[PDB]
Amino acid sequence: STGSATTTPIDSLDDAYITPVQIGTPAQTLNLDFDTGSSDLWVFSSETTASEVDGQTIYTPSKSTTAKLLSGATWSISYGDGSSSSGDVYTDTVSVGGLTVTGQAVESAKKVSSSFTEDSTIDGLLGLAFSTLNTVSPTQQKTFFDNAKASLDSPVFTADLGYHAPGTYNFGFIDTTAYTGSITYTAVSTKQGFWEWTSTGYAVGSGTFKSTSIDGIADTGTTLLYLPATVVSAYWAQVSGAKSSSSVGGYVFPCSATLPSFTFGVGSARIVIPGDYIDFGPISTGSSSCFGGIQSSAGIGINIFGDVALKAAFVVFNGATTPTLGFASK
């Protein structure tokens, strides 16, 4: 089997992407944030505290003839941005782009943190990291991809995120028309539960490529590109007026600036992020200070190839017995 679904930016900055997901019988369609940096499929639901729902579409398990409570199971998650959610668990039928999994753990939120409530466009998350990170207790549950894998034509999914435009998540096949050139594959460590890999270096604008190993994770659920402070300083030094602002929380630059591109290495190959992709707009409405899309990871503990980087590529998440990542230009 295969599946194919369009993913759509939630706003004009590409802050996140939502993909329609069918849950239950009859289907309840929720727009989920597919997140290769986490491993829980959780949804706003009829069980979510009413004051914490503000415009999201909810899953109502009592209206699904295929829903079953997973007795005793609870979940609780905290993300790198400080947000969180928790609740209980049902199993139900879940379909993405025509690919159906029966008995998928659907984690129903009883509580969500304010950032989720305040984002009416995201009805939940669909995790695509390794199932070892799944938070369900006392019996850890498998991701949608893990459950689907054996049925797929090939044990892979691909992320093709758009710049200010829709893109595609495919399951079970490589669309060879969706990228240019060849796909360069690179080794993955699953030791932290992430799609963790090592970039071979970087360049700023038309500058020379610096060969240096940068370990990080491919994370569709993170907006920006978080890299070591040395790398980030080298980038923003090429933007007149750019500076790191403790009060704003990162590098800012004059909105009148033209940003240079940023290149990252994948083996001997190179992925070029156009300068425009690094502009995240005014820090507040009407400001002439703009927020940068490349930020320091120094306070995170891990480097994160978030959407800024991933949307410059066609990305293969190869879930074979030894997983690997593939990147192509597009």
Active-site residue among 33, 35, 92, 160? 35
Count Cβ neighbours within 10 Å for each residue of 271-281 and write b for 16 or more, e otherwise: bebebebbbbe
Active-site residue among 85, 95, 108, 199? 199
Domain 5-174 identical in fold to domain 175-330: yes
> What CATH code would you report for 175-330?
2.40.70.10
Kindly give, in sequence order, each residue whose CB lies less than 8 Å from that of residue 298, ignoring residues fewer than 6 positions away: 228, 229
Kindly give, in sequence order, each residue whose CB lies less than 8 Å from that of residue 210, ignoring residues fewer than 6 positions away: 201, 202, 203, 234
- CA dihedral (100, 102, 107, 109) positive or negative: positive
Helix (H) or strand (E) holding 90: strand 84-96
Sequence ranges of the domains in the chain: 5-174, 175-330
CA distance 22 to 102: 12
- How far are the Cα atoms of 132, 160, 167, 173, 274 from residue 4, in angstroms, in the given order? 25, 11, 10, 9, 27
Experimental technique used? X-ray
* Structure tokens belonging to residue 76: 């609780």
Closest CA to 37 of 5, 78, 4: 78
* Structure tokens belonging to residue 186: 């690179």
Closest CA to 86 of 102, 73, 67: 73
CA distance 289 to 251: 10
Q: Is 35 a catalytic residue?
A: yes
- How far are the Cα atoms of 28, 29, 105, 166 from residue 25, in angstroms, in the given order? 7, 11, 15, 28
CA distance 309 to 200: 14
How would you classify the pairing of strands 184-187 and 196-204?
Answer: unpaired
In the sheet that holds 289-292, the strands lie side by side as 243-245, 250-254, 289-292, 279-282
Count Cβ neighbours within 10 Å for each residue of 236-268 and write b for 16 or more, e otherwise: bebbeebebeeeeebbbbeeeeebbbbbbbbee
> What CATH code would you report for 5-174?
2.40.70.10
Q: Is 54 a catalytic residue?
A: no
Amino acid at 150: A
- How far are the Cα atoms of 54, 125, 141 from residue 44, in angstroms, in the given order? 10, 9, 18
Taking every pair of Cα atoms in the chain, the longest distance, rounded to a whole number of angstroms, is 60
Q: 318 - beta bridge partners?
A: 156, 324
